[PDB]
């Protein structure tokens, strides 16, 4: 293990103030321009929209263009360019930081698994959502394709379980997967029509496949309001805030362009602008940097250590989504 952060102390202890509790939604394949608030022509977020004190972060690139090398990268101290794929697996990671400093750090993932950043913590600290063993919430489509929001069932317990001490829940979702974007979204999300359904994506018509990726955005809408709508039934226990950031975007048609994870050399700026959210509870002191804050996905891990008062060198000068 080669680690970067045994400095790191916590300036306060939850014995002594207010637990954090926060969730960290690691997002899948969404698009910074099919966003409303960063200026798209539908309303692809009509849920976040109603809630009281989100930002919106119109200046985000991710670290890369897949599933397998930005998620690494997203809980790395190493930042975007001192950052390796192939031994980031035994790198400390800011997940191994914040357990090692007691905070009660938990994976729930209806997406595939943590690419490795989980893989130094007790395997009970991870749990498989996209199988109905753990999910509730898979028969709700002609595909029996488990949701995101399954992964809020339960969190009360856990939460029961962790009482008193600070929670990092980081959600793992499904999202945006591609090619089959259709298959992402209950049918009340269908908001848009009519909608590619094939597997080869091309021949499919552009709006149809517009389409059916806006409405999986309104779904991943539905989950992380929901999933604030969660924190906020503990408001008055804990010092409750939600991260989201996307792992990358996605191609769709340009320069006949499809899917995601082509290297950064050469990659067209859809596959790395990325949508980021940020709630907070107006009790908890937390303040969000400008909308507008050119960021990249170096600033989740210096985000993560302020959530919870942890100061480690070797990102005290990183800017962060939170003052
Ligand atoms: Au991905």
Same mark, same amino acid.
């Given at each position: ?28 394949? $969404?698009? $910074? ?86 893989? @130094?913590?007790? @395997?009970? !600290? ?46 793992? !979702? ?32 552009? !709006? ?20 604030? !709508? ?38 067209? @700026? ?11 509870? @107006? ?41």
């Amino acid at each position: 293990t080669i680690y970067h952060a045994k400095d790191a102390v916590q300036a306060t202890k939850p014995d002594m103030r207010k637990p954090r509790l926060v969730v960290f939604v690691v997002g899948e394949t $969404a698009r $910074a321009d099919h966003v409303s608030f960063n200026g798209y022509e539908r309303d692809t977020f009509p849920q976040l929209a109603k809630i009281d004190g989100v930002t919106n972060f119109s200046n985000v690139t991710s670290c890369g263009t897949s599933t397998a090398y930005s998620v690494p990268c997203m809980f790395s101290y190493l930042g975007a360019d001192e950052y390796d794929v192939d031994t980031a697996k035994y790198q400390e990671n800011v997940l191994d930081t914040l357990d090692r400093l007691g905070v009660s750090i938990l994976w729930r993932d209806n997406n595939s698994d943590s690419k490795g950043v989980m893989d @130094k913590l007790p @395997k009970a !600290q991870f749990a498989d959502y996209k199988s109905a063993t753990n999910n509730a919430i898979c028969n709700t489509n002609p595909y029996n394709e488990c949701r995101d929001v399954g992964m809020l069932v339960g969190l009360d317990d856990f939460v029961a379980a962790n009482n008193g001490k600070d929670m990092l829940i980081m959600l793992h !979702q499904m999202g945006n997967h591609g090619p089959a974007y259709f298959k992402r979204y209950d049918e009340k999300f269908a908001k848009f029509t009519p909608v590619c359904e094939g597997n080869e994506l091309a021949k499919c018509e552009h !709006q149809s496949l517009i389409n059916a990726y806006d409405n999986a955005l309104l779904a991943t809408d539905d989950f992380i309001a929901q999933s604030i !709508q969660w924190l906020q039934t503990h408001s008055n226990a804990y010092d409750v805030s939600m991260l989201y950031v996307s792992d990358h975007g996605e191609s769709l048609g340009e320069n006949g362009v499809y899917l995601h994870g082509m290297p950064n050399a050469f990659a067209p @700026k859809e596959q790395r602008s990325v949508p980021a959210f940020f709630w907070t509870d @107006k009790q908890t002191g937390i303040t969000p940097m400008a909308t507008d804050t050119v960021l990249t996905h170096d600033a989740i891990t210096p985000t993560l250590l302020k959530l919870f008062d942890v100061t480690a060198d070797k990102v005290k000068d990183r800017t962060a989504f939170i003052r």
